[PDB]
Amino acid sequence: RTYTFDQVEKAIEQLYPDFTINTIEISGEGNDCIAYEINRDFIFKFPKHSRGSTNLFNEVNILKRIHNKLPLPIPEVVFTGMPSETYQMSFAGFTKIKGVPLTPLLLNNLPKQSQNQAAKDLARFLSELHSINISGFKSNLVLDFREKINEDNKKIKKLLSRELKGPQMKKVDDFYRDILENEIYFKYYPCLIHNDFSSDHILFDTEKNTICGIIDFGDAAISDPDNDFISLMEDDEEYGMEFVSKILNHYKHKDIPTVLEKYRMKEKYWSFEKIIYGKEYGYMDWYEEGLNEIR
């Protein structure tokens, strides 16, 4: 809705004048981009704001670098936009991967053997992704988790200055101090990770009952490989502990209690993310719910 169909076709036509568009529909809308399915062959993503453009730029760079390196299909970059005064990447066009998200509901209705195969495939995908040589990547890809925590810490202090009573704010102070005193969160061997690895981005072929793709690499970065497991593990929104445990074991993870400890911290931490990105991403539905559960 940030764009009309006419605007979308016009933008594409400027850079690809010999590309005939026969059909165009809206396939999805996230926080960052609107997705258009073109000719039932391509997914074109258009940024809704500067930040979404940065995300799209990153996805293009990452997908090109890991093309043909992974055991599951991933999108291939076919079309790229240009810088505008607004954005660094006005659009990008990827090959469409057919399939539906492996929702927790879909997963749990599968025969047990198909669930086991899904766990094995996800584990193999992650093992291979996390083993990709990262020497050629630029430094800005490496996440500085401690700096991210330090920065969030200030923003939470200001935002909640007049929202939290004394004892409430003290427990917030305790939480951040405890996190920053615990090296388990920062002392890890970084690798390339998906960084948004969850059911909505795992595509499934209900005819063969197997995973047929991984999509949406806009958050990909060099970071803690355990993050790709904790993003799967929420018992409400995502897969269960039992299913993720199958993945961890097929992956041959040697320190599952560390993963769980990171999981528990991240789950507490999500409330603060909603405060900070409720007021930064101007989304007011986020701010309140985070603030509520801090209370």
**For residue 73, with 0-12 CB atoms within 10 Å meaning exposed, 13-18 middle and 19 or more buried, which class applies?**
middle
**Are 8 and 23 in contact, with CB atoms under 8 Å apart?**
no
215 CB-near residues (< 8 Å, 6+ apart): 74, 75, 97, 201, 203
User: Which amino acid, one-letter code, is at 248?
Assistant: L
> Residue 6 annotated as binding?
no
Within a 13 Å sphere around the CA of 132, how many CA atoms are in the beta-carbon half? Answer: 27
> Residue 201 annotated as binding?
yes
Domain boundaries, the chain: 5-95, 99-295
> Residue 32 annotated as binding?
yes
Question: What DSSP assignment string belongs to the chain?
Answer: --S-HHHHHHHHHHH-TT-----EEEEEE-SSEEEEEETTTEEEEEESSHHHHHHHHHHHHHHHHSTT-SSS----EEEE----SS-S-S-EEEEPPP-EE--HHHHHHS-HHHHHHHHHHHHHHHHHHHTS--TTS-GGGB--HHHHHHHHHHHHHHHTTTTS-HHHHHHHHHHHHHHHH-GGGT-S--EEE-SS-SGGGEEEETTTTEEEEE---TT-EEE-TTHHHHTT--TTTS--HHHHHHHHHHTT-S-HHHHHHHHHHHHHHHHHHHHHHHHHS--HHHHHHHHHHH-
Taking alpha carbons only, the member of 119, 84, 121 closest to residue 212 is: 121
Could you tell me which CATH class the domain 5-95 is placed in? Answer: alpha beta
207 CB-near residues (< 8 Å, 6+ apart): none
Taking alpha carbons only, the member of 254, 32, 215 closest to residue 125 is: 215
Q: Are strands 33-38 and 221-223 parallel, antiparallel or unpaired?
A: unpaired
Question: What DSSP assignment string belongs to 231-280?
Answer: TT--TTTS--HHHHHHHHHHTT-S-HHHHHHHHHHHHHHHHHHHHHHHHH
Q: How far apart are CA 180 and CA 196, in angstroms?
A: 23
**Are 218 and 196 in contact, with CB atoms under 8 Å apart?**
yes
Superfamily grouping for domain 99-295:
Aminoglycoside phosphotransferase (APH), C-terminal lobe (3.90.1200.10)
40 CB-near residues (< 8 Å, 6+ apart): 23, 96
Strand partners, 221: 193
- Kindly state the tokens that stand for 274: 């909603």
**For residue 68, with 0-12 CB atoms within 10 Å meaning exposed, 13-18 middle and 19 or more buried, which class applies?**
exposed
**Are 191 and 225 in contact, with CB atoms under 8 Å apart?**
yes
Q: Is the four-CA dihedral 253, 254, 256, 262 of positive or negative sign?
A: negative
Measured in angstroms, the resolution is 2.0
Within a 13 Å sphere around the CA of 222, how many CA atoms are in the beta-carbon half? Answer: 16
Q: Are strands 92-95 and 210-214 parallel, antiparallel or unpaired?
A: unpaired
79 CB-near residues (< 8 Å, 6+ apart): 12, 15, 16, 19, 42, 44, 91, 92, 93
> Residue 96 annotated as binding?
no
39 CB-near residues (< 8 Å, 6+ apart): 21, 22, 23
C-alpha separations of 55 from 33, 61, 145, 251, 278 in Å: 9, 10, 18, 28, 18
User: Which amino acid, one-letter code, is at 229?
Assistant: F
> Residue 219 annotated as binding?
yes
> Residue 97 annotated as binding?
yes
163 CB-near residues (< 8 Å, 6+ apart): 291
87 CB-near residues (< 8 Å, 6+ apart): 47, 50, 53, 81
